[PDB]
Scaffold this active site. Structure first.
Site, PDB file in Angstrom:
ATOM      1  N   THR A   1       5.125  -5.032  -5.857  1.00  0.00           N
ATOM      2  CA  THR A   1       6.080  -3.919  -5.905  1.00  0.00           C
ATOM      3  C   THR A   1       5.854  -2.822  -4.856  1.00  0.00           C
TER       4      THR A   1
ATOM      5  N   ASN B   1      -0.724  -3.597  -4.765  1.00  0.00           N
ATOM      6  CA  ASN B   1      -0.672  -2.639  -5.853  1.00  0.00           C
ATOM      7  C   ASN B   1      -2.093  -2.221  -6.173  1.00  0.00           C
TER       8      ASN B   1
ATOM      9  N   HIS C   1       8.374 -10.215 -16.549  1.00  0.00           N
ATOM     10  CA  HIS C   1       6.958 -10.474 -16.784  1.00  0.00           C
ATOM     11  C   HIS C   1       6.689 -11.000 -18.183  1.00  0.00           C
TER      12      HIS C   1
ATOM     13  N   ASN D   1      -7.548  -9.954  18.173  1.00  0.00           N
ATOM     14  CA  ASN D   1      -7.631  -8.752  17.370  1.00  0.00           C
ATOM     15  C   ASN D   1      -6.722  -8.829  16.150  1.00  0.00           C
TER      16      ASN D   1
ATOM     17  N   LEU E   1      -0.032  -8.809  18.277  1.00  0.00           N
ATOM     18  CA  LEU E   1       0.426  -8.463  19.616  1.00  0.00           C
ATOM     19  C   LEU E   1      -0.436  -9.106  20.699  1.00  0.00           C
TER      20      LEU E   1
HETATM   21  C1  LIG Z   1       5.058  -2.730  13.807  1.00  0.00           C
HETATM   22  O1  LIG Z   1       5.425  -1.459  14.291  1.00  0.00           O
HETATM   23  C2  LIG Z   1       4.350  -0.545  14.214  1.00  0.00           C
HETATM   24  C3  LIG Z   1       4.889   0.860  14.440  1.00  0.00           C
HETATM   25  O2  LIG Z   1       5.600   0.859  15.651  1.00  0.00           O
HETATM   26  C4  LIG Z   1       3.256  -0.953  15.199  1.00  0.00           C
HETATM   27  O3  LIG Z   1       2.131  -0.153  14.955  1.00  0.00           O
HETATM   28  C5  LIG Z   1       1.864   0.768  16.030  1.00  0.00           C
HETATM   29  O4  LIG Z   1       1.289   0.117  17.132  1.00  0.00           O
HETATM   30  C6  LIG Z   1       0.651   0.888  18.130  1.00  0.00           C
HETATM   31  C7  LIG Z   1      -0.170  -0.077  18.989  1.00  0.00           C
HETATM   32  O5  LIG Z   1      -1.240  -0.615  18.239  1.00  0.00           O
HETATM   33  C8  LIG Z   1      -0.288   1.976  17.611  1.00  0.00           C
HETATM   34  O6  LIG Z   1      -0.523   2.897  18.667  1.00  0.00           O
HETATM   35  C9  LIG Z   1      -1.868   3.414  18.654  1.00  0.00           C
HETATM   36  O7  LIG Z   1      -1.927   4.693  18.060  1.00  0.00           O
HETATM   37  C10 LIG Z   1      -3.251   5.158  17.954  1.00  0.00           C
HETATM   38  C11 LIG Z   1      -3.311   6.368  17.026  1.00  0.00           C
HETATM   39  O8  LIG Z   1      -2.022   6.886  16.751  1.00  0.00           O
HETATM   40  C12 LIG Z   1      -2.158   7.806  15.642  1.00  0.00           C
HETATM   41  O9  LIG Z   1      -1.106   8.754  15.491  1.00  0.00           O
HETATM   42  C13 LIG Z   1       0.126   8.306  14.943  1.00  0.00           C
HETATM   43  C14 LIG Z   1       1.001   9.557  14.748  1.00  0.00           C
HETATM   44  O10 LIG Z   1       2.282   9.301  14.187  1.00  0.00           O
HETATM   45  C15 LIG Z   1       3.290  10.258  14.628  1.00  0.00           C
HETATM   46  O11 LIG Z   1       4.596   9.844  14.237  1.00  0.00           O
HETATM   47  C16 LIG Z   1       5.704  10.598  14.727  1.00  0.00           C
HETATM   48  C17 LIG Z   1       6.310   9.931  15.963  1.00  0.00           C
HETATM   49  O12 LIG Z   1       7.261   8.965  15.570  1.00  0.00           O
HETATM   50  C18 LIG Z   1       5.321  12.058  14.981  1.00  0.00           C
HETATM   51  O13 LIG Z   1       6.455  12.894  14.894  1.00  0.00           O
HETATM   52  C19 LIG Z   1       4.290  12.498  13.953  1.00  0.00           C
HETATM   53  O14 LIG Z   1       4.022  13.872  14.123  1.00  0.00           O
HETATM   54  C20 LIG Z   1       3.007  11.690  14.129  1.00  0.00           C
HETATM   55  O15 LIG Z   1       2.170  12.405  15.015  1.00  0.00           O
HETATM   56  C21 LIG Z   1      -0.080   7.567  13.615  1.00  0.00           C
HETATM   57  O16 LIG Z   1       1.112   6.913  13.220  1.00  0.00           O
HETATM   58  C22 LIG Z   1      -1.207   6.535  13.646  1.00  0.00           C
HETATM   59  O17 LIG Z   1      -1.483   6.177  12.299  1.00  0.00           O
HETATM   60  C23 LIG Z   1      -2.378   5.049  12.166  1.00  0.00           C
HETATM   61  O18 LIG Z   1      -3.640   5.388  11.601  1.00  0.00           O
HETATM   62  C24 LIG Z   1      -3.604   5.900  10.271  1.00  0.00           C
HETATM   63  C25 LIG Z   1      -5.024   6.162   9.761  1.00  0.00           C
HETATM   64  O19 LIG Z   1      -5.838   6.713  10.775  1.00  0.00           O
HETATM   65  C26 LIG Z   1      -2.875   4.950   9.314  1.00  0.00           C
HETATM   66  O20 LIG Z   1      -2.738   5.534   8.030  1.00  0.00           O
HETATM   67  C27 LIG Z   1      -1.520   4.539   9.891  1.00  0.00           C
HETATM   68  O21 LIG Z   1      -0.893   3.598   9.048  1.00  0.00           O
HETATM   69  C28 LIG Z   1      -1.753   3.967  11.287  1.00  0.00           C
HETATM   70  O22 LIG Z   1      -2.676   2.901  11.216  1.00  0.00           O
HETATM   71  C29 LIG Z   1      -2.132   1.646  11.680  1.00  0.00           C
HETATM   72  O23 LIG Z   1      -2.305   1.411  13.076  1.00  0.00           O
HETATM   73  C30 LIG Z   1      -3.645   1.255  13.529  1.00  0.00           C
HETATM   74  C31 LIG Z   1      -3.690   1.033  15.046  1.00  0.00           C
HETATM   75  O24 LIG Z   1      -3.611   2.249  15.764  1.00  0.00           O
HETATM   76  C32 LIG Z   1      -4.295   0.081  12.800  1.00  0.00           C
HETATM   77  O25 LIG Z   1      -5.642  -0.044  13.205  1.00  0.00           O
HETATM   78  C33 LIG Z   1      -4.205   0.276  11.286  1.00  0.00           C
HETATM   79  O26 LIG Z   1      -4.733  -0.849  10.620  1.00  0.00           O
HETATM   80  C34 LIG Z   1      -2.754   0.509  10.860  1.00  0.00           C
HETATM   81  O27 LIG Z   1      -1.990  -0.674  10.964  1.00  0.00           O
HETATM   82  C35 LIG Z   1      -2.463   7.082  14.328  1.00  0.00           C
HETATM   83  O28 LIG Z   1      -3.142   7.974  13.476  1.00  0.00           O
HETATM   84  C36 LIG Z   1      -3.760   5.475  19.355  1.00  0.00           C
HETATM   85  O29 LIG Z   1      -5.076   5.976  19.268  1.00  0.00           O
HETATM   86  C37 LIG Z   1      -3.728   4.215  20.224  1.00  0.00           C
HETATM   87  O30 LIG Z   1      -3.936   4.528  21.593  1.00  0.00           O
HETATM   88  C38 LIG Z   1      -5.189   3.976  22.066  1.00  0.00           C
HETATM   89  O31 LIG Z   1      -5.083   2.681  22.634  1.00  0.00           O
HETATM   90  C39 LIG Z   1      -4.278   2.591  23.800  1.00  0.00           C
HETATM   91  C40 LIG Z   1      -4.371   1.165  24.328  1.00  0.00           C
HETATM   92  O32 LIG Z   1      -4.288   1.188  25.736  1.00  0.00           O
HETATM   93  C41 LIG Z   1      -4.724   3.550  24.906  1.00  0.00           C
HETATM   94  O33 LIG Z   1      -3.726   3.616  25.906  1.00  0.00           O
HETATM   95  C42 LIG Z   1      -4.984   4.954  24.380  1.00  0.00           C
HETATM   96  O34 LIG Z   1      -5.635   5.703  25.385  1.00  0.00           O
HETATM   97  C43 LIG Z   1      -5.829   4.901  23.106  1.00  0.00           C
HETATM   98  O35 LIG Z   1      -7.165   4.498  23.366  1.00  0.00           O
HETATM   99  C44 LIG Z   1      -8.052   5.473  22.773  1.00  0.00           C
HETATM  100  O36 LIG Z   1      -8.727   4.996  21.628  1.00  0.00           O
HETATM  101  C45 LIG Z   1      -9.546   3.873  21.875  1.00  0.00           C
HETATM  102  C46 LIG Z   1     -10.173   3.482  20.543  1.00  0.00           C
HETATM  103  O37 LIG Z   1      -9.956   4.513  19.602  1.00  0.00           O
HETATM  104  C47 LIG Z   1     -10.611   4.200  22.926  1.00  0.00           C
HETATM  105  O38 LIG Z   1     -11.343   3.045  23.280  1.00  0.00           O
HETATM  106  C48 LIG Z   1      -9.976   4.783  24.182  1.00  0.00           C
HETATM  107  O39 LIG Z   1     -10.983   5.224  25.064  1.00  0.00           O
HETATM  108  C49 LIG Z   1      -9.083   5.951  23.793  1.00  0.00           C
HETATM  109  O40 LIG Z   1      -9.868   6.988  23.242  1.00  0.00           O
HETATM  110  C50 LIG Z   1      -2.403   3.454  20.090  1.00  0.00           C
HETATM  111  O41 LIG Z   1      -1.429   4.017  20.948  1.00  0.00           O
HETATM  112  C51 LIG Z   1       0.242   2.728  16.397  1.00  0.00           C
HETATM  113  O42 LIG Z   1      -0.871   3.303  15.750  1.00  0.00           O
HETATM  114  C52 LIG Z   1       0.965   1.823  15.403  1.00  0.00           C
HETATM  115  N1  LIG Z   1       1.773   2.583  14.464  1.00  0.00           N
HETATM  116  C53 LIG Z   1       1.773   2.301  13.153  1.00  0.00           C
HETATM  117  C54 LIG Z   1       2.850   2.923  12.315  1.00  0.00           C
HETATM  118  O43 LIG Z   1       0.947   1.575  12.604  1.00  0.00           O
HETATM  119  C55 LIG Z   1       2.848  -2.423  15.017  1.00  0.00           C
HETATM  120  O44 LIG Z   1       2.080  -2.858  16.126  1.00  0.00           O
HETATM  121  C56 LIG Z   1       4.061  -3.345  14.790  1.00  0.00           C
HETATM  122  N2  LIG Z   1       3.697  -4.698  14.373  1.00  0.00           N
HETATM  123  C57 LIG Z   1       4.124  -5.755  15.079  1.00  0.00           C
HETATM  124  C58 LIG Z   1       3.230  -6.963  15.111  1.00  0.00           C
HETATM  125  O45 LIG Z   1       5.191  -5.772  15.700  1.00  0.00           O
HETATM  126 CA   LIG Z   2       8.144  -4.781  -8.047  1.00  0.00          CA
HETATM  127 CA   LIG Z   3      -3.511  -8.747  20.094  1.00  0.00          CA
HETATM  128 ZN   LIG Z   4       6.511  -6.976 -11.668  1.00  0.00          ZN
END
Ligand SMILES: *[C@@H]1O[C@H](CO)[C@@H](O[C@@H]2O[C@H](CO)[C@@H](O[C@@H]3O[C@H](CO[C@H]4O[C@H](CO[C@H]5O[C@H](CO)[C@@H](O)[C@H](O)[C@@H]5O)[C@@H](O)[C@H](O[C@H]5O[C@H](CO)[C@@H](O)[C@H](O)[C@@H]5O[C@H]5O[C@H](CO)[C@@H](O)[C@H](O)[C@@H]5O)[C@@H]4O)[C@@H](O)[C@H](O[C@H]4O[C@H](CO)[C@@H](O)[C@H](O)[C@@H]4O[C@H]4O[C@H](CO)[C@@H](O)[C@H](O)[C@@H]4O)[C@@H]3O)[C@H](O)[C@H]2NC(C)=O)[C@H](O)[C@H]1NC(C)=O
Ligand SMILES: [Ca+2]
Ligand SMILES: [Ca+2]
Ligand SMILES: [Zn+2]
Ligand SMILES: CS(=O)(=O)c1cc(Cl)cc(COC(=O)N2CCC3(CC2)CN(C(=O)c2ccc4[nH]nnc4c2)C3)c1
Length: 806
Positions: free
Chosen positions: A159, A180, A265, A685, A689
């Site tokens: 759910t 859940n 259920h 990873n 992607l």
């Molecule tokens: C399905 O679609 C989704 C959504 O489009 C896809 O998921 C997205 O994919 C992106 C690529 O992986 C990924 O980009 C990351 O972002 C990293 C952090 O971003 C944080 O901030 C976000 C803020 O949201 C804003 O939203 C709106 C804008 O619309 C604004 O108005 C708001 O004000 C907000 O500011 C935030 O969403 C995001 O949340 C994640 O983390 C939370 C907990 O910490 C979770 O609760 C949440 O669910 C998110 O977690 C998910 O994603 C992470 C992966 O990031 C994953 O591990 C989790 O399991 C989970 O699934 C963040 O808090 C950003 O740091 C990344 O950039 C790094 O890498 C690039 C690569 O080159 C570098 O260019 C860049 O410099 C940087 O590197 C730095 O960090 C490295 C290691 O830390 C380090 O080595 C280096 O030196 C640097 O320091 C990257 O851009 C998005 O996070 C992600 N979005 C979502 C919603 O998940 C998904 O791929 C699609 N699926 C498929 C298969 O199609």
């Molecule tokens: Ca349900």
């Molecule tokens: Ca990959």
């Molecule tokens: Zn149910």
């Protein structure tokens, strides 16, 4: 603590919430203990029922009924939904012929048609058909509006993951609500259905529809309800909200029903008890529609009727216990049910060995009802891996069965007759979707579609711009009467090289044994024309795949197959070829068996070498264009170029061989030709992607030849199979898969037999949408067709389920 001494005189079902400890009166105050003392009194009124009797007509308003039949009720907004009906001799909505809603017909002040998202839990897809007799309202909606035969939820078909996916358009691996039930390693905390932890926003990612509306200045109703507000009061509150002065009145509203999930259920999916909870819903839809008619809104609102998952027959005996498979059943911690997830009971246990755990669970009983995977090995169509709340060990469970940890966890820790959460391609798990409204089409069936796609439709319907999600914007335009979104093909980033002959045999040193040195004016000219591309519209029917990231690659032409060879990865990214129905499979002649030939079009520096393969006893190699399907015994030499080579495990080679040798011709027959594109996939990873160079973890030993983690194929033919694949000028038909490149076949318990008995089964399991491959390859397909781009997106969202009829 909360000082709930404030009043709710006037804050009845208020929209904005108050900051503690000033007591609250919004539709959620109950779940947080902090209702107003007079909330129950003032906002949960109950007198005289929910219906206007013929006597109550034009009564004297009494302020503590649940609704009013007094002449002012209409313009006070609190009439009973049947008020117009009984008291003023009007018909119920359902008793009306469906009129086509050509233009939206809204009362003034309504800038835009409001959206109502009516969500019903556990409402299985076939309830529409098997229940139509007892659900007249829901059958009007469906037949007069726009519906699909069924909507595919997401894994796990539970759910919470499914409701937050509808509202985000993101997979659970992305929004972070992966069950859940949910332990988080970093938070040290567990998320369960009973308890307060679910409220902490830290579990919830992405941007739900309600935050997206609000960030863009569109007012949003509240979406969750306290489980103690009765449904009739829910509809009155919505209709109440609709009476709000223009600038206080929300644009998007939400209803939720615990039924039919709750009954289901207990009685199973079609227990004869089930007829009645179904009637309730339809009654409630009636009230909502009746109320909309009341307000002259009934031809101006867009209603979405939709479920989160279906129900299946499941009982306490059909339960496998792990204590029948393991030994130290108390050294692990299992998340049980319609799907198992396993982890150590302590990370102060370094003696925890996940290889052993999986092993001890593989093909261990002749009729085993679950199968163990490491999470990276699950079918890619599940997208259930890229989160730390998902345990590395997963148990995919048979439809109809349960997994538990010990017997003592089942008898006193049988009752029920239905559960849910199985693999999302299972037919019992499919759910429903209708759209009624001015912005939807009129009496229009649409093909099944995944639930991840709704968020985009809903943003379109509300004039919003979608936060980044996992749907494919535009893929559902065929539902809408008018579309905010004109989708656009992404620009090609990398352009290809078209290399000519630039090298001589002797410049190569790959260590590549071949036997081919026997060999006009006629066809010494025609074969030239093969390497230029006189057969390019023979094997590339939908145009060259677009590379969408920055790399150096080449287009290699041949008689039978075209390829996009990557100088960086040292293999093709894609190989495309047509196999007409009249095609013929042939053998790989004895002299040509260990034939691998140098490609004089590509540098020795950018070719692979046979030597690394000889030196690697783990790795063998394989070919993208099958040699078996050569057009001539002369063209067969083409398939042996080092540029058609890819690395394959011997175990995987078995699967690959049967596919190329047997299945390709099979389909070619059935569908009157197929165009097949194939290539590697690198995703170490498990994010779903494409991996880049610096993230390659496995190489063919002693070389720079990276090992794919999967291999894919897109198989396309004419949708009208009376046209040859290579002359189809109508809609297309496709089917795809992404097989895991694995060194054993432990996934397949019949592996030790003939491929004819287990390969085709493993491919069906690992089927995929073209779009999924697109994320994994960074490519983009179907660039040159006669079909609309919207049609093409739909095509690419398609999943072939190999299931029976719904
Ligand atoms: C399905 O679609 C989704 C959504 O489009 C896809 O998921 C997205 O994919 C992106 C690529 O992986 C990924 O980009 C990351 O972002 C990293 C952090 O971003 C944080 O901030 C976000 C803020 O949201 C804003 O939203 C709106 C804008 O619309 C604004 O108005 C708001 O004000 C907000 O500011 C935030 O969403 C995001 O949340 C994640 O983390 C939370 C907990 O910490 C979770 O609760 C949440 O669910 C998110 O977690 C998910 O994603 C992470 C992966 O990031 C994953 O591990 C989790 O399991 C989970 O699934 C963040 O808090 C950003 O740091 C990344 O950039 C790094 O890498 C690039 C690569 O080159 C570098 O260019 C860049 O410099 C940087 O590197 C730095 O960090 C490295 C290691 O830390 C380090 O080595 C280096 O030196 C640097 O320091 C990257 O851009 C998005 O996070 C992600 N979005 C979502 C919603 O998940 C998904 O791929 C699609 N699926 C498929 C298969 O199609
Ligand atoms: Ca349900
Ligand atoms: Ca990959
Ligand atoms: Zn149910
Ligand atoms: C489609 S949407 O408009 O975008 C949308 C999105 C979201 Cl995120 C939420 C809603 C509304 O949700 C609510 O009002 N909530 C309270 C009631 C329950 C769901 C959450 C029922 N919940 C169970 O506990 C349960 C049910 C069925 C079950 N089957 N098995 N376990 C079960 C547990 C809690 C609507």
């Amino acid at each position: 603590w909360t000082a709930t001494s404030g009043s709710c005189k006037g804050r009845c079902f208020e929209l904005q919430e108050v900051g503690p400890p000033d007591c609250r009166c919004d539709n959620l105050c109950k779940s947080y203990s902090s209702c107003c003392h007079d909330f129950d009194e003032l906002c949960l009124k109950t007198a005289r029922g929910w219906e206007c009797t013929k006597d109550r007509c034009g009564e004297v308003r009494n302020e503590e009924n649940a609704c009013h039949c007094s002449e002012d009720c209409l313009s006070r907004g609190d009439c009973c939904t049947n008020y117009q009906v009984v008291c003023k001799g009007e018909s119920h909505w359902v008793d009306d012929d469906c009129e086509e809603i050509k233009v939206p017909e809204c009362p003034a002040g309504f800038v835009r048609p409001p959206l109502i998202i009516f969500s019903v839990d556990g409402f299985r897809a076939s309830y529409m058909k098997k229940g139509s007799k007892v659900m007249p309202n829901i059958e009007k909606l469906r037949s007069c509006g726009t519906h699909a035969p069924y909507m595919r939820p997401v894994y796990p078909t539970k759910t919470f993951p499914n409701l937050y996916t509808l509202a985000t358009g993101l997979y659970p691996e992305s929004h972070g609500i992966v069950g859940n039930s949910m332990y988080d390693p970093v938070f040290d905390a567990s998320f369960h259905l009973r308890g307060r932890e679910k409220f902490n926003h830290r579990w919830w990612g992405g941007q739900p529809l309600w935050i997206t509306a609000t960030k863009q200045g569109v007012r949003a109703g509240t979406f969750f309800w306290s489980v103690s507000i009765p449904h009739e009061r829910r509809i009155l509150t919505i209709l109440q909200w609709l009476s709000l002065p223009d600038n206080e009145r929300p644009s998007v509203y939400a209803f939720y029903s615990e039924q039919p999930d709750f009954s289901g259920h207990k009685y199973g999916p079609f227990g004869p008890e089930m007829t009645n909870p179904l009637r309730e819903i339809d009654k409630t839809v009636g009230q909502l529609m009746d109320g909309l008619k009341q307000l002259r809104l009934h031809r101006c609102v867009n209603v979405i009727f939709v479920g989160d998952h279906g129900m299946e027959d499941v009982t306490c005996d059909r339960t496998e216990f792990l204590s029948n498979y393991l030994t130290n059943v108390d050294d692990i911690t299992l998340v049980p049910g319609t799907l198992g997830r396993i982890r150590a009971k302590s990370i102060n246990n370094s003696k925890y060995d996940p290889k052993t755990i999986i092993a001890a669970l593989t093909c261990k009983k002749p009729d085993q009802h679950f199968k163990p995977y490491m999470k990276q090995h699950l079918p890619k169509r599940l997208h259930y891996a890229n989160n730390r709340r998902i345990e590395d060990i997963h148990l995919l469970v048979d439809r109809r069965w349960h997994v538990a940890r010990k017997p003592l966890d089942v008898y006193k820790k049988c009752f029920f007759q239905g559960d849910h959460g199985f693999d999302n391609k299972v037919n019992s798990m499919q759910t429903v979707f209708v759209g009624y409204g001015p912005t939807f089409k009129y009496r229009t069936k649409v093909p099944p579609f995944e639930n991840i796609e709704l968020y985009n439709v809903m943003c379109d319907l509300l004039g919003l711009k979608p936060a980044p999600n996992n749907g494919t914007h535009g893929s559902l335009n065929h539902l809408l009467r008018t579309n905010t979104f004109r989708p656009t093909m992404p620009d090609e980033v990398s352009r290809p090289n078209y290399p000519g002959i630039m090298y001589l045999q002797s410049e190569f040193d790959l260590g590549c044994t071949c036997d081919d040195k026997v060999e006009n004016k006629l066809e010494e000219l025609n074969k030239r024309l093969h390497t230029k591309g006189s057969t390019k519209e023979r094997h590339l029917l939908y145009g060259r795949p677009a590379v969408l990231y920055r790399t150096s690659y080449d287009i290699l032409y041949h008689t039978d197959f075209e390829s996009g060879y990557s100088e960086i990865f040292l293999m093709p990214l894609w190989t495309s070829y047509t196999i007409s129905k009249q095609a013929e499979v042939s053998s790989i002649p004895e002299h040509l068996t260990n034939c691998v030939r140098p490609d004089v079009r590509v540098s020795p520096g950018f070719s692979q070498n046979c030597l690394a393969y000889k030196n690697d006893k783990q790795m063998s190699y394989g070919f993208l264009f099958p040699p078996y399907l050569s057009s001539s015994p002369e063209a067969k030499y083409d398939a042996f170029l080092v540029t058609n080579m890819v690395p394959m495990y011997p175990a995987f080679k078995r699967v690959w061989a049967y596919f190329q040798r047997v299945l390709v011709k099979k389909y070619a027959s059935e569908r009157n030709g197929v165009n097949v594109i194939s290539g590697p996939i690198f995703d170490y990873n498990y994010d779903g992607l494409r991996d880049t160079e610096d993230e390659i973890k496995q190489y063919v030993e002693g070389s720079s030849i990276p090992v794919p983690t999967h291999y894919y194929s897109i198989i396309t033919s004419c949708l009208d199979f009376t046209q040859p694949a290579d002359k189809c000028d109508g809609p297309l038909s496709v089917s795809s898969f992404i097989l895991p490149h694995r060194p054993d076949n432990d996934e397949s318990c019949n592996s030790s037999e003939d491929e004819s008995k287990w390969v085709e089964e493993l491919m069906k399991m690992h089927t995929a949408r073209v779009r999924d491959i697109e994320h994994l390859t960074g490519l983009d397909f179907y660039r040159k067709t006669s079909r609309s781009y919207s049609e093409i997106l739909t095509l690419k969202t398609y999943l072939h389920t190999y299931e029976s009829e719904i």
